[PDB]
Design a protein around this ligand. Structure first.
Ligand SMILES: N[C@@H](Cc1cc(-c2ccc(Cl)cc2Cl)cc(CP(=O)(O)O)c1O)C(=O)O
Ligand SMILES: *[C@@H]1O[C@H](CO)[C@@H](O)[C@H](O)[C@H]1NC(C)=O
Ligand SMILES: *[C@@H]1O[C@H](CO)[C@@H](O)[C@H](O)[C@H]1NC(C)=O
Lengths: 286, 372, 42, 49, 50
């Protein structure tokens, strides 16, 4: 075995601030004024070789609705309406393009890739991780001619036992963690909130030891070797370690949801309010 | 001189022998001759040569090199030992290096240091060209938004007819219009009457246009999916004891006449027979005709695949992860029985690991650049 | 040595071209109405 | 009409006379939808800078 | 009608996918690029003899 990493991983929720996100707050009103500009320009353009009608026609095509009965009966007003419609196409088209380019690009930050990873290449305080105290890990981190910079960064936050670390990172207190492989491999495949980088880090291997020159060594050494052709340890694996399964299933771009599209739903309430106003105001005007 | 561990090359004539940081090795050749063999074969470098040279430089003993003339990683030939280890039972030499495994039959006479590079029977797989979902066209929106849409339809139709009662637009025509509008378009139909009520269908249309735009935008992501690497556990898998669950094309790669074979014909023999027609000539044909669907899953010793991966131009050649391997053994060093160097080379090679150098060496030869 | 970002409406200045073509069409509309007030002469 | 079709839609007219003008404008509208789609895509290409 | 919307939309989205990743392989990033570290026969690179 060797050493690996461990960090929480979950489905992101990359989400737009609002349906109006991909525009600035100015252009939204620019088009709103310009539509009435070109409407009244039509109204003062066709009348010489239908007010509310031309208003409707003008302000509809920005909605691709079916509403609208009138039309230009001149020639010049026709040559205007054509480009007006073209503009109406371009607006919504650019909107779609921008929203798409946004939602394809914003795939969340990479996972911690390994010892040479940039996102942890330096010791850093905005990204905190721990290690195991009094253990083989700070033993191998003692003689670190180069790694001393992160060696101190760890030894200023070292941890004692695994039940500290796993339970902590599950609680999103820390960012990263280190150990020998088998422990975290199992802990990942048991409950599926955490994963590993799968990157091996420093070879080693467990074994058995006795005080020197005890008369057992030869017998046990041949026994173990006998216990790897008949595959008894192969069975022990399935008995304890390669025990469960949680599929890899590379995550997705995190569907939009019930979360923020209610920014749009804010529109139907304004519609209702304006309607219950405009009914009485229409009674009056009638 | 078999693997890329122990390479030998032609002697350099321009500056005498080899001119670069290697050790020579000789070759005494006589076959079908009375006469005497012997001559300087070549300069002689490699990974195993590297570890040997450094470890000798550090434990202060000197050596020399000549190759094996008759044998290989030898086995029992009439209860004897030929080739490499045979050159050590006869006390004709002191130690054995190079790519060499560890078992019982060899642990009987010679003795073995602590191994350094891991090894074991592993598998080789290949990726898959994309996995566009079957239920894609309903992914990019939550469960809420649709029933929310439906009830907004209902309430807008209600308020429409009721602000309308201040041919005749009713529930049916209105709901039909609204559906046909929120979806892109369809079916020219009657409009609402009254100038004032037109505001409602208008703002609805605004809602709908932004909706369709957002939807195509989002769904434009679920067509960009990353490369899908298959999954399989160790050789205790449903996918291989019962390989006819799917098509027979699921062919298995294992070259005959070697340690793979012998370590196979001892435990199952059913994979052994089922692999009858799926024999393959060595590693060349294997790692060529594997890319083109004629060879799909593989059986071999990992210490060669974990090398050959980082050489092929493509990237569709990746083993399964570690910790899922069969014959947990390791290459090592072989010495005469119960000598006085086991202890010293042991301590020094563990020192080599502890100080972090073998990583540099593997970086020099063993692993390539083609990290996955 | 490279990365990519997504802007917000991308500008007003980048979008200015559309309003340029809008104003140009409006001007052509005006001159054509004038030319029609002319060519009723025929 | 045919200008009001490449760009999205407006201005109700039918030209429905003899069903063969219908089978004519049909292929035109088809070409229109594929055109608009291609445009949206390859323009969403440039908004990534 | 809903099915019509879905087919058209999916068409647009797939085309959007295929155009965005239509850009050639990266420029040789130096002396350590894959396509140059270990040789290949697609595109060759050498210098002047001697
Ligand atoms: N390891 C064995 C001999 C032996 C060597 C190799 C091998 C082949 C190519 C390369 Cl480059 C490197 C190696 Cl190590 C493979 C097998 C596998 P097979 O059984 O199918 O012949 C084997 O047995 C020993 O030392 O007793
Ligand atoms: C996978 O996609 C690549 C893309 O160019 C193609 O060349 C290759 O033939 C495809 N292979 C399979 C098995 O789909
Ligand atoms: C491999 O072994 C099989 C049976 O043991 C035999 O039929 C075949 O000829 C052998 N091939 C080689 C190359 O030794």
């Amino acid at each position: 075995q060797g050493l690996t990493i461990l960090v929480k991983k979950e489905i992101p929720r990359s989400t737009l601030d609002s349906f109006m996100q991909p525009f600035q707050s100015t252009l939204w009103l620019l088009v709103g004024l310009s539509v009435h500009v070109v409407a009244v320009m039509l109204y003062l353009l066709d009348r010489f070789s239908t007010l509310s009608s031309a208003m409707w026609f003008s302000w509809g095509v920005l909605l691709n609705s079916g509403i609208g009965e009138g039309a230009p009966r001149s020639f010049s007003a026709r040559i205007l309406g054509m480009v007006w419609a073209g503009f109406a196409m371009i607006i919504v088209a650019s909107y779609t393009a921008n929203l798409a380019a946004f939602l394809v690009l914003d795939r969340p930050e990479e996972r911690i890739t390994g010892i040479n990873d940039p996102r942890l290449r330096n010791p850093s305080d905005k990204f905190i991780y721990a290690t195991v105290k009094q253990s083989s890990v700070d033993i191998y981190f003692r003689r670190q001619v180069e790694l001393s910079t992160m060696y101190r960064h760890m030894e200023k936050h070292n941890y004692e036992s695994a039940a500290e670390a796993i339970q902590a990172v599950r609680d999103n207190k820390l960012h990263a963690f280190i150990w020998d492989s088998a422990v975290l491999e199992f802990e990942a495949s048991q409950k599926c909130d955490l994963v590993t980088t799968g990157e091996l880090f420093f070879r080693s291997g467990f074994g058995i030891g006795m005080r020197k020159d005890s008369p057992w060594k030869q017998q046990v050494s041949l026994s173990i070797l006998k216990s790897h052709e008949n595959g008894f340890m192969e069975d022990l694996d399935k008995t304890w370690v390669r025990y469960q399964e949680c599929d890899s299933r590379s995550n997705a771009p995190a569907t939009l949801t019930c979360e923020n599209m209610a920014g749009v739903f804010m529109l139907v309430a304004g519609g209702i309010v304006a309607g219950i106003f405009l009914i009485f105001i229409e009674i009056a005007y009638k | 001189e078999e693997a890329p561990f122990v390479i030998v090359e032609s002697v350099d004539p321009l500056s005498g022998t080899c001119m670069r940081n290697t050790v020579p090795c000789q070759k005494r050749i006589i076959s079908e001759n009375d006469e005497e063999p012997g001559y300087i074969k070549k300069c002689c470098k490699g990974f195993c040569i590297d570890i040997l040279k450094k470890i000798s430089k550090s434990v202060k003993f000197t050596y020399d090199l000549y190759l094996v003339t008759n044998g290989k990683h030898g086995k029992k030939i009439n209860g004897t030992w030929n080739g490499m280890i045979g050159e050590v039972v006869m006390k004709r030499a002191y130690m054995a290096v190079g790519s060499l495994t560890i078992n019982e039959e060899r642990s009987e006479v010679v003795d073995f240091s602590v191994p350094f590079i891991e090894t074991g029977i592993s598998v080789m797989v290949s990726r898959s060209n994309g996995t566009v979902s079957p239920s894609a066209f309903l992914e990019p929106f939550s469960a809420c938004v649709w029933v929310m849409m439906f009830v907004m339809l209902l309430i807008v139709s209600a308020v429409a007819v009721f602000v309308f009662e201040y041919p005749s637009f009713t529930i049916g025509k209105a709901i039909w219009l609204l559906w046909g509008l929120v979806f892109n378009n369809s079916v020219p139909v009657q409009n609402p009457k009254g100038t004032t009520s037109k505001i409602m269908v208008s703002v609805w249309a605004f809602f709908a246009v932004i909706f369709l735009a957002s939807y195509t935008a989002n769904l434009a992501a679920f067509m960009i999916q990353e490369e899908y690497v298959d999954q399989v556990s160790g050789l205790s898998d449903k996918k291989f004891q019962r390989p006819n669950d799917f098509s027979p094309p699921f062919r298995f790669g294992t070259v005959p006449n070697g340690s793979t074979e012998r370590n196979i014909r001892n435990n199952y023999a059913e994979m052994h027979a089922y692999m009858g027609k799926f024999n393959q000539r060595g590693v060349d044909d294997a790692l060529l005709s594997l890319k083109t669907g004629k060879l799909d899953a593989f059986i071999y010793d990992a210490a060669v695949l974990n090398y050959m991966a980082g050489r092929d131009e493509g990237c569709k050649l990746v083993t399964i992860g570690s910790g899922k391997v069969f014959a947990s053994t390791g290459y090592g060093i072989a010495i005469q029985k119960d000598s006085g160097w086991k202890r010293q080379v042991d301590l020094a090679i563990l020192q080599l690991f502890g100080d972090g150098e073998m990583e540099e060496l593997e970086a020099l030869w063993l692993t390539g650049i083609c990290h996955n | 040595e490279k990365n990519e970002v997504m802007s917000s409406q991308l500008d007003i200045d980048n979008m200015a071209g559309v309003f340029y073509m809008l104003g140009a069409a409006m001007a052509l509309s005006l001159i054509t109405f004038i030319s029609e007030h002319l060519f009723y002469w025929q």
